[PDB]
Write a structure and sequence with these properties.
Chain C: This is Spike protein S1. Chain C: Residues 33-226 form the BetaCoV S1-CTD domain. Chain C: Residues 18-34, 154-189, 218-240 are annotated as: Disordered. This is part of a larger assembly, with six copies of chain A. Chain A is mostly beta strands. The first copy, chain A, contains one helix and 16 strands. In chain A, the strands form three sheets. In chain A, strands 1-3-14-5-10-11-12 form a seven-stranded antiparallel sheet, with no helix packed on it. The radius of gyration of chain A is 18 Å and the shape is globular. Chain A starts with a strand and ends with a helix. Chains B and C meet through helix 3, helix 5, helix 11 and helix 12 of B and strand 1, strand 11, strand 12 and strand 13 of C. Bound molecules: a molecule of 2 linked components (NAG-NAG) and 2-acetamido-2-deoxy-beta-D-glucopyranose (7 copies). One 2-acetamido-2-deoxy-beta-D-glucopyranose binds at residues 315, 317, 325 of chain C.
Chain lengths: 224, 346, 366, 50, 198, 50
């Protein structure tokens, strides 16, 4: 692939808890994305599994839905149980077991006591698609936000909040991940989460309008 | 930092300097008198209508009786401070309807009946300058009987057992006392603070005032229009400086802000666990058996009692400081207003 | 409250008044399903230390009283919940785990421990909310000459965290050389067996452990218990059981636009302010019913025994736990006169009371 | 110590109000010294003759 | 040499801040006030400084008492010699006796001994098994060390709260004395006072 | 005995703090009384309502 490098540009926040609040300022000890961090503009044309360190910011600007599915696992060589996420058209297929064609699966779109399966609404929903993934206490949290934009060169500036959609209770051990490249170029943004102490501003509704990265600079420490 | 401009006065064995003119300058001094009176219920704060928590709190003795006694003493002391500062005049004097006092314009400090609460222009500017807090000293529960709009701050303060009492004297009674003091001082002079109010023209009163500071009284009568113009310009300058700058009433703003944040911290102390497994008493009471829930409730009771004692001690120290400032303001009202003071910088 | 038989003239604060609720609101979920414990407490063989079958339990009414008829545990050993309050307190997701360990290994299935099962096998978390059921098992799963089906890793390179099942039959070795199965000096026994025999001491006998994790979350209303649900009332001070949170208050119409995933209503003081109805979806508001201080205005007992009562800071229509409304509450027992005197007993914002001859009575004035 | 800090975090906001009280005392001391000594607009100088 | 008290007070988490005005600036303010009250009299506190000979200022200050100004001018050498002897007695009284400045000595001593007591409070066990925290962490498991840590936290928090309350009361007392000193600087130095025993 | 010791220590500390605040108030009143003895009794005062 191609490794172009850019910046975070003041985004990567989400609602930490499913509790409503309004016109209040709240501080959460959580695992947000740092402000103005070092994200990679991956161009998938020529791909080993990237590590899963405490969370993935994963984003895509693809209009035509080239990026469809995801795989997770520890070894991902038909040796561990791993994980499989399939966005089969207007459905989601989740398998806790594996099939493991080879290292990069390339499913041809042209199992030893499986535990959990799932089916739901379609997973996907001038476009900036954002999925924050994390795995805490064996629970695979999924965040999403549809972001109409006007800039198609890098990560646009501004502020937006990511809402939770689907919660999973399984996954056990995940330390690798890889996007889907099934053919029937491409661009996916990825960032790494770290524990932070963000302070959030709520409007008259429960909408996160602004936030501060509490260890970015001493002015934000004063604001904290 | 710089201490100031360097000056070297030309001292000599036979050289003296004597002024040939004067300026009349009017300054401003702001002094706090009283703060917010609060009363705290122990049972609704520590326990919140739980019978088991009340039974475990009954073993701790009489901490809450002396907390209530301390808060009631502070609340009585605030009314005593306000009555000591303002209620010094015996009769409510009134200004005559003809507003001519030798050429001095008192129209910005005398009341007008255009508004219901009869306050002057400068009193209106001072009342609009202090951005007050929530401060539910009125019938607050009528607004919180129906949960409307969003969550307020005084309403969540009220729901946890913290109650704000209204002051004994309303704002229009304090304005009436101030108007009586102005009507005494302009008309009678210093004679109303020592017995019966004896009238005198304002030019002859100001001649007495110049004669008190070592200047012969003929200087007034030959410069009456200039002195009246200087006083009017100084009053207009104070009005413009109060209308423009909003950073002069910081002492009263701090008086509001400290009593806001103390109650905010006292409300926020309920969310802590204090070493227990939950900050909510019902979850502790429903999850565990008798002995373990008694242990958790004892931990929560100790934490909430410590926070309440810290609040009461801070209120007592702030009440002592406010009482010292109120005594200073009472002395300044007695000496500067009801007479002429020879103490320099006072 | 003054601990004396004669009170002097003045105003005294005595107690506080609170209106009591009439009835209760119980809106527990309605799940017409039950779960069988027979398929989790006496299976023919349970598991090894790493083969613990995660029987995730949801959407069924659980009866927690008939568990004592099963395999003989001494006590329903729980951590965080008492084993008689599960019939009304209800959880969000129950996970069933089962493993067979030694006699001196049950203490590591406590929240917060170190050892061999706490390091190389299924370690319970320190903040564990659930119940662990264990007993001695030299009756069924104690086949002689070594029961090698329950077999464990004695040595492990890394800590085995909670919910980190390790079914690997591979090798750990360290120190000099690659090993590839040479058992003598380097490539020691990878995953050995317990060797469960009835000739062992009672501190090393096989023990069967059943673990149930009754976790707590603010998730949507999943699996709960057999508590009989009731109907709904509104706009009065009653007790509620909306989902799991309980208390008392008055439920009014709301004007706050909740997001579709947000449910609860936690406040600055960590109390619930606006919560969602679990069945008929309307996101209402919570405000507690009427309360305030009460104060008694009296002259001296050497003058009269008449009193006036001041309910501080209420509109004077929700009075019960002469009527005059004041900015400091409302006054009961004092007649308001259109006169003005010196202040005898201070009440509130410019209102005083006194004992005057205008028949003797307690009057209130400005 | 990390474990002591994690146990101390459960005790609420006593540290913040203790720090606020000592900061108020520290500002008040400088206010006292400034309002006692700094009472002149200009720094006068004695003449060379004595 | 050895370990100082101040080094241990620093190492335990306590920091002493320097004042905003250094002693040179306080001396400059004092010398400016002295030069003003020597050259100009009381006129430098009511506006602009107006120069006047010192004998005329002394005559005005006798005339404010109730003694006419002819008493000064016919006796000026006697008042001068008496004032010289009286100000020379001050250095003799202060170079040998060291008990006059006991109030400032108490101001130093109280703020030394409060920090000494608050440092000494760190060696107490408060019902735990050891006052050293690392011995508790290295000797016990999680739950028992958490119990001992909770005991130590409660004891040290109580000690810190007692120190803060005592400092608040002493700050109120010091502020009252500073207000009295400000009034005395305003009324005695910048003018003449008719108040008895002030 | 540790529980009883903690309770009695808390009560004694509360009594000491209230006595310190009362002593500060009484000392302010005694300074005012000393000033009034120095000015009203030992002389004649020109201050109004003093
Ligand atoms: C004393 O000062 C006043 C003002 O402080 C002088 O009055 C000013 O006189 C000039 C012309 O002489 C006018 O242009 C100004 O408008 C006057 N100002 C005011 C406020 O009236 C006055 O002349 C001075 N007298 C002496 C003798 O110097
Ligand atoms: C991101 O990392 C690369 C690694 O060499 C570096 O060159 C680049 O400057 C970094 N971007 C930042 C710090 O914004
Ligand atoms: C809150 O929601 C209402 C209803 O959708 C909307 O009219 C209002 O603009 C929102 N306020 C914000 C987003 O600040
Ligand atoms: C008084 O001052 C003048 C000017 O400095 C000087 O000439 C004169 O000698 C002085 N008088 C005495 C007695 O020193
Ligand atoms: C000054 O007095 C006149 C009355 O002669 C009045 O009209 C005017 O408004 C007064 N000035 C101010 C600033 O009020
Ligand atoms: C519970 O009630 C809701 C509506 O009141 C209904 O949709 C649901 O099917 C019910 N659940 C069961 C298990 O019958
Ligand atoms: C559990 O099942 C076994 C075999 O199916 C049986 O022997 C045992 O009695 C059962 N337990 C109970 C409590 O009946
Ligand atoms: C609350 O009191 C006010 C003041 O008299 C009154 O107008 C209003 O009707 C009251 N609200 C009620 C009774 O709901």
């Amino acid at each position: 692939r191609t490794q172009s490098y850019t910046n975070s540009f003041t985004r990567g926040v989400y609602y930490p808890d499913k509790v409503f609040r309004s016109s209040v300022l709240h501080s959460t000890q959580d695992l947000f994305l740092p402000f103005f961090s070092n994200v990679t503009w991956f161009h998938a044309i020529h791909n080993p599994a990237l590590p899963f360190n405490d969370g993935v910011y994963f984003a895509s600007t693809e209009k035509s839905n080239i990026i469809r599915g995801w795989i997770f696992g520890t070894t991902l060589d038909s040796k561990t149980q791993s994980l499989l996420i399939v966005n089969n058209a207007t459905n989601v297929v989740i398998k806790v077991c594996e099939f493991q064609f080879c290292n990069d699966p390339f499913l041809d779109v042209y199992a030893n006591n499986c535990t959990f399966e799932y089916v739901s609404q379609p997973f996907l929903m001038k476009n900036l698609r954002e999925f924050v993934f994390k795995n805490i206490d064996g629970y695979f949290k999924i965040y999403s936000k549809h972001t109409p934009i006007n800039l198609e060169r890098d990560l646009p500036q501004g502020f937006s909040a990511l809402e939770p959609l689907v919660d999973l209770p399984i996954g056990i051990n995940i330390t690798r991940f890889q996007t889907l490249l099934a053919l029937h170029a491409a661009a996916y943004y990825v960032g790494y989460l770290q524990p932070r102490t963000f302070l959030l501003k709520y409007n008259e509704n429960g909408t996160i309008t602004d936030a501060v990265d509490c260890a970015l600079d001493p002015l934000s420490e004063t604001k904290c | 930092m710089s201490l100031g401009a360097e000056n070297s006065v030309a001292y000599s064995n036979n050289s003296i300097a004597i002024p040939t003119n004067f300026t009349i300058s009017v300054t401003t001094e702001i002094l706090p008198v009283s703060m917010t009176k609060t009363s705290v219920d122990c049972t609704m704060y520590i326990c919140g209508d739980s019978t088991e928590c009340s039974n475990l709190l009954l073993q701790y003795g009489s901490f809450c009786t002396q907390l209530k006694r301390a808060l009631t003493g502070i609340a009585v002391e605030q009314d005593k401070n306000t009555q000591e500062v303002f209620a010094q005049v015996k009769q409510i004097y009134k200004t005559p309807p003809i507003k001519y006092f030798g050429g001095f314009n008192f129209s910005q400090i005398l009341p007008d009946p255009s508004k219901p609460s009869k306050r002057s222009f400068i009193e209106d500017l001072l009342f609009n300058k202090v951005t007050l807090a929530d401060a539910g000293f009125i019938k607050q529960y009528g607004d919180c009987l129906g949960d409307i709009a969003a969550r307020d701050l005084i309403c969540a303060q009220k729901f946890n057992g913290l109650t704000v009492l209204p002051p004994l004297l309303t704002d229009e009674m304090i304005a009436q006392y101030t108007s009586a003091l102005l009507a005494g001082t302009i008309t009678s002079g210093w004679t109303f603070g020592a017995g019966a109010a004896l009238q005198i023209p304002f030019a002859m009163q100001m001649a007495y005032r110049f004669n008190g500071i070592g200047v012969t009284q003929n200087v007034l009568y030959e410069n009456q229009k200039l002195i009246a113009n200087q006083f009017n310009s100084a009053i207009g300058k104070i009005q413009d400086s109060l209308s423009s700058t909003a950073s002069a009433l910081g002492k009263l703003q701090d008086v509001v802000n400290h009593n806001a944040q103390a109650l905010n911290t006292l409300v926020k102390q309920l969310s802590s666990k204090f070493g227990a497994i939950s900050s909510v008493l019902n979850d502790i009471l429903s999850r565990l058996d008798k002995v373990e829930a008694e242990v958790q409730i004892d931990r929560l009771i100790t934490g909430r009692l410590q926070s309440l004692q810290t609040y009461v001690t801070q209120q007592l120290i702030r009440a002592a400081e406010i009482r010292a400032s109120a005594n200073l303001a009472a002395t300044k009202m007695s000496e500067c207003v009801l007479g002429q003071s020879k103490r320099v910088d006072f | 409250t003054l601990k004396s038989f004669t009170v002097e003239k003045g105003i005294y604060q005595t107690s506080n008044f609170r209106v009591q609720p009439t009835e209760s609101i119980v809106r527990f979920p309605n799940i017409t399903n039950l779960c069988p414990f027979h398929e989790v407490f006496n299976a023919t063989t349970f598991a090894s230390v790493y083969a613990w079958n995660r029987k995730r339990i949801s959407n069924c009414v659980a009866d927690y009283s008939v568990i004592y008829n099963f395999a003989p545990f001494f006590a329903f050993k729980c951590y965080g919940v008492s084993p008689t309050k599960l019939n009304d307190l209800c959880f969000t997701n129950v996970y069933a785990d089962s493993f067979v360990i030694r006699g001196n290994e049950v203490s590591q299935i406590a929240p917060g421990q170190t050892g061999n099962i706490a390091d190389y096998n299924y370690k319970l978390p320190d903040d564990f909310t659930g119940c662990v059921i264990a007993w001695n098992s030299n009756k069924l799963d104690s086949k002689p000459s070594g029961n090698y089906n329950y077999l464990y890793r004695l040595l492990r390179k890394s800590k085995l965290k909670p919910f980190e099942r390790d079914i690997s039959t591979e090798i750990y070795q360290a120190g000099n050389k690659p090993c590839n199965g040479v058992a003598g000096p380097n490539c020691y026994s990878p995953l050995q067996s317990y060797g469960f025999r009835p000739t062992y001491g009672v501190g090393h006998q096989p023990y069967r452990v059943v673990v149930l994790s009754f976790e707590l979350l603010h998730a949507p209303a999943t699996v709960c218990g057999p508590k009989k649900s009731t109907n709904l009332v509104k706009n009065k001070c009653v007790n509620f059981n909306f989902n799991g949170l309980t208390g008392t208050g008055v439920l009014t119409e709301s004007n706050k636009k909740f997001l579709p995933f947000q449910q609860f209503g936690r406040d600055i003081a960590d109390t619930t302010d606006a919560v969602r109805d679990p069945q008929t979806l309307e996101i209402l508001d919570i405000t507690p019913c009427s309360f305030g201080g009460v104060s008694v205005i009296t002259p001296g007992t050497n003058t009269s025994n008449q009193v006036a009562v001041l309910y501080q800071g209420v509109n004077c229509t929700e009075v019960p736990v002469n009527v005059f409304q004041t900015r400091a509450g409302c006054l009961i027992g004092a007649e308001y006169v259109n006169n003005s005197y010196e202040c005898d007993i201070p009440i509130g914002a410019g209102i005083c009371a006194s004992y005057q001859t205008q028949s003797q009575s307690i009057i209130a004035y400005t």
